[PDB]
Structures are given as C-alpha cells and as structure tokens.
Amino acid sequence: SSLKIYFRLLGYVKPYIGMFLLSIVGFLIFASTQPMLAGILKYFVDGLSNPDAALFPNLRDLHLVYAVPLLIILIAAWQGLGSFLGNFFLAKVSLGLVHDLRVALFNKLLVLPNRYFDTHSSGHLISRITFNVTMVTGAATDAIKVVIREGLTVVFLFLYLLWMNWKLTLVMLAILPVIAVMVTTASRKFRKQSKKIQVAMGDVTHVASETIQGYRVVRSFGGEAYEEKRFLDASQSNTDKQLRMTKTGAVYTPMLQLVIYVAMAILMFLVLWLRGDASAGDLVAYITAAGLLPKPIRQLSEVSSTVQRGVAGAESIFEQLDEAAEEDQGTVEKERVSGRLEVRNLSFRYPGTDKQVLDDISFIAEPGQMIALVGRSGSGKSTLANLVPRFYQHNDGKILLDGVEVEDYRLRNLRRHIALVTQQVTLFNDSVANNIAYGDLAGAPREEIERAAKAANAKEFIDNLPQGFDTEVGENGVLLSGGQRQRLAIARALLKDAPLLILDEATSALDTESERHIQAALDEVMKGRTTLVIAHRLSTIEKADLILVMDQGQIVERGSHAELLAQNGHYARLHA
C-alpha cells in the first residue's frame, strides 16, 4: 500500500507540463504574499507613533497614513492573481489526467482477453472507469495543491524570520525534526489501516453485486435474510475500520499544533526577556509571521491521511492498464476469404486447469458445405467453435482459414470474416433495427435490415411491435420474449454476410415450426458460405454435408445421416 503507485500518474502529466509550470508560478505569488502581509504590521506600528512619517524617504511624499493602506490593497490583488493562476491551471492538468486515464482504461477493455471479463464481475470493472479514477485523481490533486502551496508558504515564512533574526529562528527550526518524526509514525499507522478499510469496502461491493444481479433467485428461493445479514456484517466492518482511522487523525493534527504553539511560547519568552534595541514593530512582525506557521502545518497534516486513502484505487487502476492483452502479432489482412476451414490435431485445455477439453480433432470444411456438431452436454462443441474466432488461444494443432493459420490473421480482419451466434443471446438497449445492424453493418439501408429479419422469421413480431423496427428492446431485450431475442440475434449474423457462419444452438428457444421457417431460408443462401452448426435438436442437421459426433473432447463418429444411422452408434442412440 505504498504511495509510490502515484508516481505512475506522472507518465500522463507529460503533455500538460507547461500548464503545471504556470500553476507553480501562481502558487509562488500566493506564498510570497504571506510574509508581506506580516511585514506591513511593522510600518503600521511605526505609523501609530508617527503617521506623518514618509514610507520611502528616497513617492518621497506619501506618508504612512496613506501608504500603508494602499499597500494592503496591492498585496491583496497580487495574492488574487496567484490564486487564480495556481488553482485554474492545476485543475486543467488534473481534469486532463482524468480524461487520459479514463480513455486508456476503456480502450484496454476493448483489447483485454475474454478470460479477464469472465473472471471479473461487471460491477468490479465499471467502478474502475467511473469512480476510482475520480477518487484517485482527486486525492492526488488535493495533495499536490497543498504540498506546493503550504511547502512554499513555510519556506517563504522561514526565510523572512531568518532575515529578521536568524538566532531566534533556530528555535522554530528545532521543531521541524520533531514534526518529521511524528509524521512518519502516523503514516505507518495510516497505511496499515488503509489496507484494512480497502478489503472491507470490497466485501460490501461484492455482497451488493451478488444481489443486484441474482435478485430473482433471492426472491424465489428465499435468502433475503441471508443476504441482509451478509451486507450488515460487511457494512459494520467498513464503518468500524473507517472510524479507527478517524480517531488517529483526530489526535494527530492537535498534537502537531501543540508542538508549534509550545515553540511559539518559548520564542515569545525570549523576546520579552532578552529584549535588545529592536523596535516594537520589528518584534510584532516577527511574532505575527511565526503565528502564520501553524495554519499551513495543519493543512499538511490533514492531507497526510487523504493520500494514504486513495492509494488502494490507484493500485487497481494501474493493474488493468498493465494486464496482458490478446496476442495479435499477425499481419495478414485479406479483404475476403473463400470460407475453407481446416482443423488439424487440435488439442486445448482451458488456462488454469488440467482437464483436456478437446484432444486430436481434425476436420476440413469447404465453401458451400454444411458441417453439423453433436455431443453429450459438454463434449466440447462450444469450446471448439470459440477457437476459430480466437476467443481462446490454442497451443497444439492448427486452425487454418482459407489456407492461412488464424494466428497469422490480424484479430480484427479474422473476426470480420466470421459470423457467430453464441448460445447466450445478448442485445443492447436500443431499437430493434440498431441491434440487428451493429458495428460493421451499421448504417445499412432499412430494406436490407428488414430482409434479414424476414429470414430469421422475426419481421412478423417486429411489425406488431408498438413502434415497428424502431421499438426499444429494453435492457438486454427484457421487453422481448426469449425466442424473439434469439431470432433477433440470428438476424444480426445474417446481415453480416461472411464466408463462415457459426451457430451454436440457435433454435433452443424456438418451437418446431418457427425453427423450420429458419432452416427453410438458411438452405437457400448456404451455397456461398461455410456453415458450422452446434445443435442438440437432431432435426435441422440431417441435411448437413458432414456430421461430427463428439464424446469427451474426441470425435467418435463421422459421416452423414444415413451412414451414422447405419452404424448404429452414438448418433443412433441420440436420434431416438
């Protein structure tokens, strides 16, 4: 939980270096006014005795009665300029870093591997690009402003005190070592407590996420009591840990102030006891300047905890940015491909496991040919179909599309040549038309969109919708039925005319007649495409050119409907 993680933020402050320099200049101006405001008291005291005296004798008329009031205004304006220049330009830099960090994180998500999204929950990932960035940057920005403003102020004040009387200033200098030791001890405590508070807050988020995501299960199978108890315990821990940090700071700041004022007391005793020929105004200015030291130290003490509290978020932000991305070392970029797909001795095991999902799988697909896949509820049908789009990296075997290994193709170009209907249908919260035409096919004419819907036997329900093809499907298509959502997904794939079309159980939520209207229209456009089908209903794959039956990651049988039935094996048992 070191604060060194903040050093990484500097890489994003390079383009804003010039603006940051201006902020320092403004803070310098503001800091310089603080000693000036103390010095004017010297002349004011002298003026009280003799207001007719002239402030400058070598102007050369302006008496203290008018000069001292005038200087007050000028110093105030000078301080105001520094305040605006420092606060405005520093915020420019801060907001720029927020924008850069957010954009970088979002782009990283678009390139991270599927496993990352698989392991982490959506609530985890969204919090990083909406709240963590703001909190981390805000804490750092406040710290920078205080350290620059209060550090300069202290430096200027000490320099002024040293100029007036270096001997007495030594007393104030001796407190600096004491303050440093106290700051060190407090920081050690803050970091430890910050670790604890961090883990507790994460548990709170986890209980909430598990509930806002599986509300239906909680309602139906009970568990409101179980879930409420978990959240209560989690929240209690976070509050207790957070209070523990407050108590430490509530004693930390007062102690340091006491040290300063104890030292100030000593200094005043010396001035009152061992008084020289110094004028009363000289002494008043010195004491006044010393009294302007406690304020900056208090502000620094307060930020000492804020920095230690934002480190946790920075660690997570700078972890996703360092996460490894999908391997895309290929260069080949063909405009179009014939559609021939060949797999040769392909064996895969999910990363972080020891089970061989698939082993020694070989099959050749040619344009205009239909390939069907059947299995036993987990034979690896969905795993093999997710290796062609290179969603998961394969190490053994060779997957070749149009004669070139899928690895040699640039990820974007390869995925452009393949259209896939995943088993889990997912629909954005937008119009039916916008969902049917997303990304590459975006902007397609309405006529083409409607044509694809007709093929998916979707136009009928889409037309009866309240606003036609412009109706909003709702969040994840909740406003639509399960089979209706599946048909919309089929339409999206049909619109993206690609040489290879993969469909993984695209008729699971459709009846026997609606599924027929889809297979009766897919066979008329199968001549210019290579079709891969993974289905459990042994009725839409009878006309497939080649049918592959898998059993525990191995292809046990090959052939067609007639040959497979004649063999009287796994296919014969499954068909019955």
Considering only residues 410 to 449 of the shown chain, the ones binding a copy of itself according to CB under 8 A are 412, 415-416, 418-420, 422-424, 426, 428-429, 438-442
378 annotated to a ligand binding site: yes
Nearer to a copy of itself, 2 or 481 (CB): 481
Report the interhelical angle of 294-320 vs 133-164 (nearest 10°). Answer: 150
C-alpha dist (Å) from residue 329 to 113, 231, 411: 15, 46, 9
Nearest to Zn ion of 206, 340 (CB atom): 206
Among 21, 166, 269, 344, the residue binding a copy of itself under the rule CB under 8 A is: 269
Q: Are strands 341-348 and 546-550 parallel, antiparallel or unpaired?
A: unpaired
Alpha helical stretches, state H, 321-445: 381-385, 411-416, 432-436
Partners of 342 in the β-ladder: 364, 400
Which of the listed partners (a copy of itself, Zn ion, none) does 467 bind, with a CB threshold of 5 to 8 Å by partner kind?
Answer: none
380 annotated to a ligand binding site: yes
Which of 107, 185, 362, 393 lies at the binding interface for a copy of itself (CB under 8 A)?
Answer: 107
63-102: which residues touch a copy of itself (CB under 8 A)? 64-66, 68-70, 72-73, 75-77, 79-81, 83-84, 87-88, 91-92, 95-96, 98-99, 102
Site string for a copy of itself, 305-344 (x = CB under 8 A): ----------------------------------------
Nearer to a copy of itself, 83 or 366 (CB): 83
In eight-state DSSP terms, residue 214 is: S
Buried b (16+ CB within 10 A) or exposed e, 397-429: bebbbbeeebbebebeebbbbbbbbbeebebee
Kindly list the distances between the CA atom of residue 508 and the CA atoms of 405, 479, 576, in Å, as whole numbers in the listed order: 32, 19, 18
- 4 and 11 Cβ atoms separated by less than 8 Å: no
On whether 573 is known to bind a ligand per the annotation, the reply is no
The residues in 95-134 that bind Zn ion, with binding defined as CB under 5 A, are 120, 124
Listed ranges 124-132, 152-160, 307-315, 362-370: which one lies at the site for a copy of itself (CB under 8 A): 124-132
Q: How far is the CB of 382 from a copy of itself (least distance, A)?
A: 7
Q: Report the C-alpha gap between 394 and 382 in whole angstroms.
A: 14
Q: Provide the mask over 199-228, with x wherever binding to a copy of itself is found by CB under 8 A and - wherever it is not.
A: --x--xx--xxxxxxxxxxxxxxxxx-xxx
Give CA–CA dist 120/297, Å, rounded: 42
Considering the rule CB under 8 A, would residue 400 count as an interface residue with a copy of itself?
no
Q: Measured in Å, how far apart are the chain's first and last C-alpha atoms?
A: 62
Between 326 and 360, name the residue whose CB sits nearer to a copy of itself. 326
Among 22, 538, 546, 556, binds a copy of itself (CB under 8 A): 538
Residue type, 48: L
Chain contacts with Zn ion (rule: CB under 5 A): 120, 124, 206, 382, 482
